[PDB]
Design a protein around this nucleic acid. Structure first.
Ligand SMILES: [K+]
Ligand SMILES: [K+]
Ligand SMILES: [K+]
Ligand SMILES: [K+]
Ligand SMILES: [K+]
Ligand SMILES: [K+]
Ligand SMILES: [Mg+2]
Ligand SMILES: [Mg+2]
Ligand SMILES: [Mg+2]
Ligand SMILES: [Mg+2]
Ligand SMILES: [Mg+2]
Ligand SMILES: [Mg+2]
Ligand SMILES: [Mg+2]
Ligand SMILES: [Mg+2]
Ligand SMILES: [Mg+2]
Ligand SMILES: [Mg+2]
Ligand SMILES: [Mg+2]
Ligand SMILES: [Mg+2]
Ligand SMILES: [Mg+2]
Ligand SMILES: [Mg+2]
Ligand SMILES: [Mg+2]
Ligand SMILES: [Mg+2]
Ligand SMILES: [Mg+2]
Ligand SMILES: [Mg+2]
Ligand SMILES: [Mg+2]
Ligand SMILES: [Mg+2]
Ligand SMILES: [Mg+2]
Lengths: 327, 567, 128, 49, 132, 15, 50, 101, 81
RNA sequence: GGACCUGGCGGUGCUUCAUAUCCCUCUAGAGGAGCCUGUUCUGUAAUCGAUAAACCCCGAUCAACCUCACCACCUCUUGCUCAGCCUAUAUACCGCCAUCUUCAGCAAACCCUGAUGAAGGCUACAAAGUAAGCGCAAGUACCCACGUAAAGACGUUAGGUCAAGGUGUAGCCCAUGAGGUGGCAAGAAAUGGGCUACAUUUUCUACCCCAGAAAACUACGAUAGCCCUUAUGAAACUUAAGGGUCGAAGGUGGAUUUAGC
């Protein structure tokens, strides 16, 4: 016997969590759950996971930017990654007849879908999407290739085009994930009333570093006051006044509303832009829903995200680089 | 906030590896920590220049180095006073001699301040970090005193107090005569010491000693000196020798304190408690002395007045155990828990003695449901138990018929340093195996006996031969059978022959019942073979049982015939 | 300066020069090589040149049931301790110098013919 | 005060209470250089005399 | 290539702690600070002095508990209190740890003129986050 | 290679 | 304790500064650091000195 | 025990500048006004020029306290860029992090 | 007595356990300031407090009786000074 | 010498590409002038390092003394240090980085093919590969999920740094160490980067965008030169600011070349 440096694979190996381990981790979580409830003077019976997270954030305050790195006291089911069960018994016989494919769960699904397509022959969008590969890989609890995912989707689509019945429709919906779309419909500000009873709306707008707050009155003669000044005295530049005109002109309401707005920060153009957005948002309270959608599609209700880019070190500007020295 | 019962005292490091697991480690861990502090102070004071940068605001005087050396090198009176404050006995004497030879005048106040230093330490140097009678016959104190030109009352008083402190009782009484011949008046502190010398100077009968003391007290009244607490405390402390003779005289001192206006301290009652607590039947007198002393002390907060105040609670609990009075023990503990009275418990040795006698009295005279509440409140939070209290606790569980707690007492016993105590493991095993129990309990007793077996196998005396008592082996084997772990029990039978320990009759009979259930004739013969080796009388009768009960093969029959030949 | 000092790991990583263009392509050959030595190996916490005896750190805390006090070894008693540590260092070096020499192969510098021992035991408790 | 820090920790090393890994490293390099013949000369007795 | 405080990939046999496994850009994102004091806050003074003290204490504890430290020190300052929190191994006898705690707390209290406490947490072995 | 072949019980409160 | 208290969060301050990345040359390569100071303001009213 | 001889010279310059600060402050006050006679200010000019050269505070250099690097030092921590980064990059400087924005 | 974990987990791993967890040691925890403790602490501190004058109901009433305002600031920092 | 493999290379084939990108296209520049600054060369008794891309307002978020490591002269010798050395070696190194990277690959442990040769290992209606880990990705920071930062493995250039500090080896120890005084750093010239200009979309003033004048030898144009004052300092023809005086080249710049979605 000669001592070739002995090998140890277990060092870098992963730590699999046996089912007995999880069973004892849950006993600790239930005892700790009652301890934590006793610490905070709350009833242990009605102590929820939201209360645990709130109590842990107080007792162990962490400012780490990444939430996953902060203290956590969760149920082991949530913490520990799901573990694939034994795939054979004591006699060594695998449970599933497709074990030796190495992908028994995936190929069993292809077998079940292929079998349904056969029976149909013997017998004979907007709100939903197909699940992604990372969601299929969790239903099956296996690792999948990209082409494996495509083959499964191509086989489901081939099943919808057929005259699939109710039994063949509950199955496909297991792999359709509803896509919840946020509405682009603009939110309308409430219509308020002043001491004199004149209806008005109020909104806010931001352009670069300029911040504006505008009060649009339901009825008026077209007067606009900016920090108490006539708009043409506050904005001597003709382009800044055209920006103030743009919202009212677009909906054919020049000379129909009075506006009193306040703006701070930014330059002359950014201030006119911020007022344009504030007036447009407030003006949406006095127009029809169809007119509000036209203003949205005209770019009058979107906050401009274009702000100055920081300079980086080692270059002259935000993008400009120093001269590449002559070689 | 109250004491945390799951924790060890705050002084220890709150870590499972660093927490003390025994009363021995409780004492030694603190001594190791104090040693580290002393080594730091030794370095701080030896190399003060490294620790002289003061960045603290406000200044912290107690975090600066200490300078124990005199900084005045001139020979004069003002330089001697410095060496007296630093308590330099040799340097101060040398400086005093040189100063005297030169002929310069040394004030009286300073000459006395030099005697106070020599008379207190006995012409010896006080202990430092690193460099019988003790009234040395050749002592600077007596010499300087004789050479002294003018001697005041204070000069004699410090000589009389120093002699008595160092056990020169006879010299101090002789010096007390000169003070009177010189028409001087002593102070109360001198009288306190002379009372100590009157009793300890010579051994005589009580009546002779009690007549001298009353003469010192009357002298103290002639000289217009008022007695203090230590005057009466010294009388009671010195009467401890005479015991029964001093019982009524001692109570006359206490009644005098109350009238005069001096208030008895905890030490005043400690001395009376010890005086009345002589070996014998305490019921005759000690009963009503402790009952009356506690009614007086009920609901009183105490302040330190005498050095012996930290001995009352240890003394009072000692009698409550002797009388076996649990109601009185609660009153003593109640007094210890009022206000800040808990600080008079005493050093670690006195704290462990107090709680041992207190808890051992609870286990004895208190209900088991309350006993286990004190067990949780006191151990290890207040003290670590001695192995004899674990036994007193098991005896309390036995008397209450609550034996499901035995496995917990063993688990705790290990955590307190009693894993390898023989008297304890024998006690646990005997109680567990004394009688049969339901299957659920019997299984638990077999898991504990297994852990005990491991303790016997992995003793630290494993370097030497392993000592397996006979009772321990019999009990551990019986517990395995009754639990159904017959395989483990059969294996252990070898250890009876290896260590030559007699098997118990009950163990042999239960082994047969495990064989007849398994219908194994060889094992049944193995039992008869074991009892035959020791020549037990039950064997010859057991062989008859084996014949009928089990089918005997010709080889087995000859084997029994071989044992029959031995018969 | 105390603050310019580094740890032993930093000092050995630098001194050994195992990472570098020399060690990348074996551009440097090593007939003479700096060998790493653990200098904390035979060192006892609490033991210094002055020979102080710290109770509870390098000597027992209690002696004859009483707590020991700070003490210092005599000049003669300390030389023996120092000498004993030097001999223990050469003895340890002698233990490393004593390595059992293995049989050679077809020739002294040849690998051919040398035994490598039995193959490693397989994962399923297989042995060879 | 670099004197205080260096002098304090040097003293603590001689007392056995501080292990200076850097100093130990230097002491081993200096020890092995004597065995190699590369010892520091006596002041005034340098290679040039 | 960036080098600062990066344990480089090896053969999968090098155990690294959580702190050692995170490069500097993860500071304040995945790993916290090893010392907490007020000197680096806006409008606060004496950052230079707190920094020198911290560098010393790390060297002092490394050499005072040689071979015992299983992770970097966590230094906490509240008022004038200095708390040193160390993760140590379970090889030295408890007596030697109590000696060094008493010794270190006292020596550091007189050196920096402030009450110093040392808190020891023992682990059986260096806690391994991953094998690089 | 040829020159040289290259070169439990835990209890509480131990004394 | 019966004290009237209001709370608000003043705006945070981030102090940034730049340092060279290399020990020697390579000027155009820098490392940038920041110190973030966050604020909370407790405003108590109508309380005695005790 | 200072890092180098150059740090040791700056230590002495800082100690001597501290000892002469009051003397130099008082003499400079006589030179920094148009009230006193020139005959008196000319004598004060000679007096401050006769003080030791290393008493002048303009000769003090802010060197790295751990490496004595004379440039690239951050005054707030008194450390060179290299030493500061070493401590900052190991999370040993309270509240300091890499800046991304 | 809490099974609290902290640390960014490795792939298919879990946040590190509390034993030997330096990230939890770095946190200024509030275990000594639980709501139960704070309420008990403040019950003991009520004996130290005094009652604001009821007559001074509004700031305008304070200004009438106490026209002078004195502002001073105390600074709490960590360190020896 | 034969055959074959790998690499390198080809004034080597074909194919598809680069998105501020190789060419053209778009905008503002550099290349010409003065000035500022770096380097080279020359000069000087008088540092060093960087020095194709990936050096050249680079180590320096910075040199009148100091800094300083250089030169000349003088002085000290167990020396601020249980010495010291900015002495040699970055081709011994740690530490921290450049570079491809404006990449996506590296890879332990196994398995199989080639007769068990150097070698090779992919086809999805799939034919021998499985792969921990690392990187990318994800996540986080900044104002979003966008963008910008940050991140960016292994390897390439014995790439940069012994003068950040530390340190292997070699060398110095009345000197290659330490201190003091004074001094060097100029420009025949060449060149890189930048600033200011050559003007009318300009110049001056008011104003901060509805004005009045200026507008070619008293215009535009020096942040230069010269003189004075002030600021900092112990020290200023020297550094900085301001004023005065002066009013030059320059009239929008060849080959070539830089940056930006
Ligand atoms: K080729
Ligand atoms: K040009
Ligand atoms: K390198
Ligand atoms: K170096
Ligand atoms: K070197
Ligand atoms: K140019
Ligand atoms: Mg630009
Ligand atoms: Mg040979
Ligand atoms: Mg980079
Ligand atoms: Mg300067
Ligand atoms: Mg040009
Ligand atoms: Mg040069
Ligand atoms: Mg060069
Ligand atoms: Mg070079
Ligand atoms: Mg190059
Ligand atoms: Mg000079
Ligand atoms: Mg100079
Ligand atoms: Mg030199
Ligand atoms: Mg290199
Ligand atoms: Mg993004
Ligand atoms: Mg980047
Ligand atoms: Mg990334
Ligand atoms: Mg090179
Ligand atoms: Mg020299
Ligand atoms: Mg000018
Ligand atoms: Mg001046
Ligand atoms: Mg002109």
């Amino acid at each position: 016997a000669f001592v070739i440096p002995k090998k140890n694979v277990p060092t870098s190996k992963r730590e699999t969590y046996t089912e007995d381990f999880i069973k004892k981790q849950i006993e600790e979580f239930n005892i700790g759950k009652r301890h934590l409830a006793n610490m905070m003077g709350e009833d242990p019976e009605t102590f929820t996971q939201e209360d645990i997270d709130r109590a842990i954030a107080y007792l162990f305050p962490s400012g780490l930017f990444e939430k996953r790195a902060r203290p956590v006291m969760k149920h082991p089911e949530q913490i520990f990654p799901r573990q694939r069960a034994i795939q054979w018994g004591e006699d060594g016989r695998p449970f599933h007849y497709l074990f030796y494919t190495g992908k028994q769960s995936y190929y069993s699904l292809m077998h079940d879908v292929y079998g349904m397509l056969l029976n149909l022959e013997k017998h004979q969008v907007i709100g939903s999407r197909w699940l992604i590969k990372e969601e299929l890989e969790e239903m099956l609890v296996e690792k999948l290739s990209d082409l494996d995912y495509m083959q499964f989707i191509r086989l489901l689509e081939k099943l919808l085009t057929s005259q699939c019945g109710a039994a063949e429709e509950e199955f496909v919906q297991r792999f359709r994930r509803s896509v919840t779309l946020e509405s682009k419909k603009q939110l309308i500000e409430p219509v308020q009333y002043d001491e004199q009873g004149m209806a008005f709306s109020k909104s806010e707008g931001k352009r670069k570093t300029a911040k504006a707050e505008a009060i649009v009155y339901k009825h008026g003669s077209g007067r606009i006051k900016v920090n108490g000044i006539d708009y043409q005295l506050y904005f001597p530049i003709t382009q800044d006044r055209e920006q103030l005109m743009f919202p009212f002109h677009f909906v054919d309401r020049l000379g129909k509303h009075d506006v009193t707005c306040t703006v701070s920060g930014g330059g002359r153009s950014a201030q006119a832009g911020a007022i344009r957005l504030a007036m447009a948002k407030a003006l949406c309270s006095f127009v029809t829903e169809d007119e509000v959608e036209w203003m949205r599609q005209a770019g009058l209700l979107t906050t401009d995200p274009r702000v100055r880019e920081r300079k980086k070190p080692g270059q002259e500007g935000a993008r400009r680089k120093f001269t590449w020295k002559k070689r | 906030v109250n004491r945390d019962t799951t924790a060890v005292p705050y002084v220890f490091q709150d870590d499972p590896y660093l927490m003390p697991a025994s009363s021995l480690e409780s004492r030694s861990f603190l001594l190791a920590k104090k040693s580290g502090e002393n080594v730091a102070k030794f370095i701080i004071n030896s190399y003060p220049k490294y620790f002289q940068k003061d960045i603290a605001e406000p200044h912290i005087p107690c975090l600066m180095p200490e300078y124990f050396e005199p900084q005045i090198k001139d020979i004069s009176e003002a330089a001697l006073k410095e060496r007296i404050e630093l308590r330099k006995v040799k340097a101060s004497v040398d400086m005093f001699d040189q100063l005297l030879q030169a002929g310069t005048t040394v004030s009286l106040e300073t000459t006395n301040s030099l005697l106070d230093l020599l008379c207190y330490y006995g012409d010896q140097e006080p202990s430092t970090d690193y460099h019988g009678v003790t009234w040395r016959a050749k002592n600077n104190a007596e010499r300087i005193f004789s050479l002294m030109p003018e001697k005041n009352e204070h000069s004699y008083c410090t000589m009389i107090r120093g002699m008595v402190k160092h056990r020169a009782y006879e010299q101090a009484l002789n010096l007390y005569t000169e003070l009177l011949n010189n028409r001087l008046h002593a102070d109360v502190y001198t009288f306190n010491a002379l009372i100590e010398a009157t009793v300890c100077a010579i051994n005589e009968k009580f009546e002779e000693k009690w007549s001298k003391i009353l003469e010192l007290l009357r002298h103290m009244v002639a000289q217009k000196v008022k007695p203090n607490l230590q005057t009466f405390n010294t009388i009671l402390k010195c009467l401890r020798r005479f015991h029964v003779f001093a019982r009524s005289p001692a109570l006359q001192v206490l009644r005098e304190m109350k009238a005069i206006g001096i208030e008895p301290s905890l030490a005043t009652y400690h001395h009376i408690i010890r005086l009345f607590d002589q070996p014998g039947d305490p019921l005759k007198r000690s009963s009503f002395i402790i009952y009356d002393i506690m009614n007086e002390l009920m609901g009183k907060r105490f302040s330190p007045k005498d050095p012996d105040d930290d001995k009352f609670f240890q003394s009072a609990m000692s009698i409550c155990s002797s009388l076996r009075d649990l109601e009185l023990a609660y009153q003593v503990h109640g007094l210890l828990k009022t206000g800040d009275n808990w600080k008079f418990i005493g050093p670690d040795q006195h704290r462990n003695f107090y709680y041992s006698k207190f808890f051992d009295l609870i286990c004895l005279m208190e209900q088991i449901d309350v006993t286990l509440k004190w067990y949780e409140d006191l151990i290890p939070s207040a003290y670590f138990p001695h192995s004899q209290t674990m036994i007193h606790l098991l005896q309390a569980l036995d008397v209450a018929n609550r034996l499901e707690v035995i496995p917990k007492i063993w688990k705790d016993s290990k955590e307190y340093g009693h894993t390898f105590r023989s008297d304890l493991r024998e006690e646990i095993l005997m109680l567990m195996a004394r009688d049969k129990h339901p299957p659920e309990l019997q299984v638990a007793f077999a898991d504990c006996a297994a852990d005990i077996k491991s303790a016997y196998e992995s003793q630290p005396i494993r370097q030497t031969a392993q000592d397996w008592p006979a009772t321990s082996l019999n009990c551990i084997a019986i517990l395995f059978l009754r639990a159904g772990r017959t395989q483990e029990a059969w294996k252990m039978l070898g250890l009876f022959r290896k260590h030559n320990k007699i098997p118990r009759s009950e163990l042999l009979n239960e082994l047969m019942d495990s064989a007849k259930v398994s219908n194994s004739p060889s094992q049944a013969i193995e039992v008869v073979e074991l009892a035959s080796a020791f020549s037990l009388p039950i064997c010859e009768g057991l062989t008859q049982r084996v014949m009928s009960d089990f089918a005997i093969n010709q080889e087995q029959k000859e084997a029994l015939s071989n044992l029959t030949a031995l018969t | 300066s105390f603050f310019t000092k580094l740890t032993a790991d930093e000092l050995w990583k630098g001194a050994l020069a195992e990472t570098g263009a020399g060690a990348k392509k074996g551009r440097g050959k090593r007939t003479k090589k700096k060998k790493r030595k653990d200098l904390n190996r035979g060192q006892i916490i609490g033991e210094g040149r002055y020979g102080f005896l710290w109770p509870g750190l390098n000597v027992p805390l209690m002696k004859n049931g009483a707590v020991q006090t700070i003490a210092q070894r005599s000049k003669e008693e300390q030389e023996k301790v120092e000498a004993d540590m030097i001999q223990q260092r050469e003895e340890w070096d002698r233990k490393k110098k004593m390595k059992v020499k293995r049989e050679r192969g077809w020739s002294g510098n040849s690998w051919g013919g040398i035994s490598l021992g039995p193959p490693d035991p397989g994962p399923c408790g297989e042995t060879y | 005060n670099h004197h205080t820090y260096a002098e304090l920790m040097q003293t603590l090393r001689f007392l056995g209470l501080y292990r200076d890994e850097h100093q130990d490293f230097m002491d081993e390099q200096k020890r092995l250089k004597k065995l190699r013949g590369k010892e520091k000369p006596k002041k005034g007795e340098g290679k040039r005399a | 290539k960036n080098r600062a405080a990066r344990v480089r990939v090896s053969k999968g046999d090098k155990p690294v702690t959580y702190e050692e496994a995170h490069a500097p850009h993860y500071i304040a994102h995945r790993k916290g600070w090893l010392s907490l004091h007020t000197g680096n806050l806006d409008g606060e003074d004496h950052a230079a002095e707190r920094t020198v003290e911290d560098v010393f204490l790390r060297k002092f504890m490394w050499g005072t508990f040689p071979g015992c430290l299983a992770d970097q020190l966590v230094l906490k300052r509240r008022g004038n209190q200095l708390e040193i929190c160390a993760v140590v191994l379970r090889q030295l006898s408890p007596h030697k740890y109590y000696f060094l705690v008493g010794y270190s707390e006292t020596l550091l209290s007189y050196f920096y003129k402030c009450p110093v406490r040392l808190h020891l947490q023992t682990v059986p072995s260096k806690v391994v986050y991953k094998y690089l | 290679y040829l020159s040289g072949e290259e070169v439990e019980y835990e209890c509480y409160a131990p004394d | 304790l019966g004290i009237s208290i209001k709370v608000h969060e003043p705006p945070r301050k981030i102090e940034r500064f730049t340092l060279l990345q290399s020990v020697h040359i390579y000027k155009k390569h820098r490392v940038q650091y920041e110190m973030r100071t966050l604020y909370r303001c407790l405003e108590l009213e109508h309380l005695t000195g005790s | 025990h200072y890092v180098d001889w150059r740090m040791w010279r700056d230590v002495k310059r800082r100690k001597m500048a501290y000892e002469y600060a009051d003397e130099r402050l008082r003499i400079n006050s006589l030179r920094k006004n148009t009230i006193l006679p020139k005959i008196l200010q000319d004598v004060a000019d000679e007096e401050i020029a006769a003080l030791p050269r290393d008493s002048c505070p303009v000769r003090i250099r802010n060197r790295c306290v751990m490496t004595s690097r004379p440039r690239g030092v951050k005054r707030r921590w008194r450390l060179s860029r290299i030493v500061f980064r070493h401590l900052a990059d190991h999370g040993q400087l309270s509240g300091i992090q890499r800046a991304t924005w | 007595p809490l099974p609290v974990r902290m640390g960014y987990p490795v792939k298919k791993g879990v946040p590190m356990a509390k034993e030997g967890n330096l990230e939890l040691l770095k946190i200024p925890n509030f275990l000594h300031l639980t709501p139960v403790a704070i309420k008990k602490h403040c019950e003991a501190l009520k004996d130290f407090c005094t009652e604001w004058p009821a007559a001074l109901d509004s700031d305008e009433k304070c200004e009438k009786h106490f026209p002078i305002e004195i502002d001073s600031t105390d600074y709490v920092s960590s360190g020896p000074s």
